[PDB]
Scaffold this active site. Structure first.
Site, short mmCIF file in Angstrom:
data_model
loop_
_atom_site.label_atom_id
_atom_site.label_comp_id
_atom_site.label_asym_id
_atom_site.label_seq_id
_atom_site.Cartn_x
_atom_site.Cartn_y
_atom_site.Cartn_z
N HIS A 1 0.85 -1.20 0.00
CA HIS A 1 0.00 0.00 0.00
C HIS A 1 0.89 1.26 0.00
O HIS A 1 1.25 1.79 1.07
CB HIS A 1 -0.97 0.01 1.19
N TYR B 1 -0.97 7.05 3.33
CA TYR B 1 -0.42 6.19 4.40
C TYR B 1 1.12 6.29 4.43
O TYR B 1 1.68 7.16 3.76
CB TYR B 1 -1.03 4.77 4.37
N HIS C 1 -2.71 6.77 -1.01
CA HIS C 1 -3.80 7.25 -0.14
C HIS C 1 -3.33 7.92 1.15
O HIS C 1 -4.09 7.98 2.14
CB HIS C 1 -4.85 6.15 0.13
C1 LIG Z 1 -15.64 1.48 2.01
C2 LIG Z 1 -14.34 1.71 1.28
C3 LIG Z 1 -13.14 1.19 1.82
C4 LIG Z 1 -11.93 1.28 1.11
N1 LIG Z 1 -10.77 0.74 1.67
C5 LIG Z 1 -9.58 0.79 0.94
C6 LIG Z 1 -8.44 0.10 1.39
O1 LIG Z 1 -8.45 -0.71 2.37
N2 LIG Z 1 -7.30 0.19 0.61
C7 LIG Z 1 -7.22 0.93 -0.56
O2 LIG Z 1 -6.14 1.00 -1.18
N3 LIG Z 1 -8.34 1.56 -1.04
C8 LIG Z 1 -9.52 1.47 -0.31
N4 LIG Z 1 -10.67 2.04 -0.85
C9 LIG Z 1 -10.64 2.48 -2.29
C10 LIG Z 1 -11.06 1.32 -3.21
O3 LIG Z 1 -10.05 0.33 -3.28
C11 LIG Z 1 -11.30 1.69 -4.68
O4 LIG Z 1 -10.14 2.26 -5.27
C12 LIG Z 1 -12.50 2.58 -4.95
O5 LIG Z 1 -13.59 2.19 -4.11
C13 LIG Z 1 -12.78 2.46 -6.47
O6 LIG Z 1 -13.84 3.19 -6.86
P1 LIG Z 1 -15.25 2.55 -7.02
O7 LIG Z 1 -15.79 2.21 -5.62
O8 LIG Z 1 -15.99 3.69 -7.66
O9 LIG Z 1 -15.10 1.31 -7.93
C14 LIG Z 1 -11.89 1.94 -0.15
C15 LIG Z 1 -13.09 2.47 -0.66
C16 LIG Z 1 -14.30 2.37 0.04
C17 LIG Z 1 -15.59 2.78 -0.65
O1 LIG Z 2 -11.35 4.28 5.57
N1 LIG Z 2 -11.40 3.93 4.39
O2 LIG Z 2 -12.47 3.70 3.86
C1 LIG Z 2 -10.25 3.78 3.61
C2 LIG Z 2 -10.21 4.35 2.35
C3 LIG Z 2 -9.08 4.23 1.51
N2 LIG Z 2 -9.21 4.86 0.32
O3 LIG Z 2 -8.32 4.83 -0.50
O4 LIG Z 2 -10.25 5.45 0.02
C4 LIG Z 2 -7.89 3.47 2.00
O5 LIG Z 2 -6.84 3.27 1.33
C5 LIG Z 2 -8.03 2.86 3.36
N3 LIG Z 2 -6.99 2.12 3.98
O6 LIG Z 2 -6.08 1.66 3.30
O7 LIG Z 2 -7.01 1.90 5.21
C6 LIG Z 2 -9.19 3.05 4.10
#
Ligand SMILES: Cc1cc2nc3c(=O)[nH]c(=O)nc-3n(C[C@H](O)[C@H](O)[C@H](O)COP(=O)(O)O)c2cc1C
Ligand SMILES: O=[N+]([O-])c1cc([N+](=O)[O-])c(O)c([N+](=O)[O-])c1
Length: 362
Positions: A179, A184, A182
């Site tokens: 990762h 982090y 975003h």
């Molecule tokens: C509820 C939620 C949790 C997510 N958690 C992560 C995460 O753990 N790691 C990450 O890299 N992106 C996270 N994302 C981003 C998603 O991986 C993804 O890139 C995004 O939802 C894509 O757009 P879409 O929902 O329109 O397909 C999260 C998004 C949402 C909606």
């Molecule tokens: O709280 N979250 O929903 C969340 C969202 C994203 N994201 O890209 O939108 C992440 O990368 C993570 N994440 O990696 O922990 C969490």
């Protein structure tokens, strides 16, 4: 159409190009940050995906930023994840673990000893993370100000990523996703906005990318380069972390460096949930000529946009997030042109089976 054709992704072969994006759902057991049988059922329901990428999983206790997020450092975590990967494989699926360190996106109340979280520099993230209240329900709380890592602490961070990849191999994962997106820890070092260091880990783009490239080299050595993917979000702003005043040139530097390692895939998160400027086809061409493995695109994609960019030869697969929350059989629905289940955003974070395992298949 090409979405339902196979793709070789490092050491495995996906039967289609419809991938499940990493999605934090905050349903793990505390104490212990332990995956559950309910999480196992959720992932098994989605095993027809070309590839499942897990929720963000912390590499250590210090790496934890969210109450309810799982880890991959303790014996009990390894044993629980082993059951989850076994269930995916029983349904003929493939699964990658997304490994992270949250850095400054955290709170003192969930850190070891109740002390400050760590980062490149001592600057507050100025956002919120998710904790749990006295009844176990998810709540959003302002981030705690971090302390800057000392130079002599950096090898320990690299070692924690290395050890987590060793643990992922034992737990039966097919691949790992680092990762580096975003806002982090790895992105905190990459961005000038969050990195004011004056040692060899700050300043120039070469210095800012030093940590993530040390991590890539360590994990390729531990396992194999054909088992390693990476997620980047190098254009635009993500959780208050921008990519600096030379974002395109700095992105192309990092991608050229990653290509030298021969890793399995490059996963580009193109925009935040709140939107941003679209990638130009010229920038997509510059990425494509610099990286010789699989490229995965993500961020509000439709099947139509995915088919367009795959047919143009610019990406190889698409990761869907919120459509995968709501549609366990998203592959079959896209293949048959069937309507999708409605999304229930109120149950994206925390809780139990409702809004998690109760979205029906066709
Ligand atoms: C509820 C939620 C949790 C997510 N958690 C992560 C995460 O753990 N790691 C990450 O890299 N992106 C996270 N994302 C981003 C998603 O991986 C993804 O890139 C995004 O939802 C894509 O757009 P879409 O929902 O329109 O397909 C999260 C998004 C949402 C909606
Ligand atoms: O709280 N979250 O929903 C969340 C969202 C994203 N994201 O890209 O939108 C992440 O990368 C993570 N994440 O990696 O922990 C969490």
């Amino acid at each position: 159409e090409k979405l339902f054709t196979p793709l070789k992704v490092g050491a495995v072969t996906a039967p289609n190009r419809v991938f499940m994006a990493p999605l934090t759902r905050l349903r793990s057991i505390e104490p212990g940050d332990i995956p559950t049988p309910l999480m196992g059922e959720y992932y098994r329901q989605r095993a027809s995906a070309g590839l499942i990428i897990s929720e963000a999983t912390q590499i250590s206790a210090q790496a934890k930023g969210y109450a309810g997020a799982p880890g991959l450092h303790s014996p009990e975590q390894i044993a629980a994840w082993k059951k989850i990967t076994a269930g995916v494989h029983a349904e003929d699926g493939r699964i990658a673990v997304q490994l992270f360190h949250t850095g400054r996106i955290s709170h003192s109340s969930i850190q070891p000893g109740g002390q400050a979280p760590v980062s490149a520099s001592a600057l507050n993230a100025n956002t919120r993370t998710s904790l749990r209240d006295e009844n176990g329900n998810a709540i959003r709380v302002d981030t705690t100000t971090p302390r800057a890592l000392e130079l002599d602490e950096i090898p320990g961070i690299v070692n924690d990523f290395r050890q987590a990849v060793a643990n992922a191999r034992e737990a039966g994962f097919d691949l790992v996703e680092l990762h580096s997106a975003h806002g982090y820890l790895l992105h905190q070092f990459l961005s000038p906005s969050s990195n004011q260091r004056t040692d060899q880990y700050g300043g120039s783009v070469e210095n800012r990318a030093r940590l993530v490239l040390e991590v890539v080299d360590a994990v390729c050595n531990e396992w194999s380069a054909d088992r390693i993917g990476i997620r980047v979000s190098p254009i635009g702003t993500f959780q208050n972390v921008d990519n600096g005043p030379n974002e395109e040139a700095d992105a192309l530097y990092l991608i050229e460096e990653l290509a030298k390692r021969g890793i399995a895939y490059l996963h580009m998160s193109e925009t935040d949930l709140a939107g941003g400027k679209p990638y130009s086809e010229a920038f997509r061409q510059k990425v494509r000529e610099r990286f010789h493995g699989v490229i995965i695109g993500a961020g509000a994609y439709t099947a139509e946009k995915a088919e367009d960019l795959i047919g143009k030869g610019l990406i190889d697969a698409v990761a869907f997030g919120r459509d995968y929350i709501a549609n366990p059989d998203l592959v079959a629905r896209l293949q048959k042109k069937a309507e999708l289940n409605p999304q229930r955003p109120e149950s994206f974070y925390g809780g139990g089976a409702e809004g998690y395992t109760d979205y029906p298949s066709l």
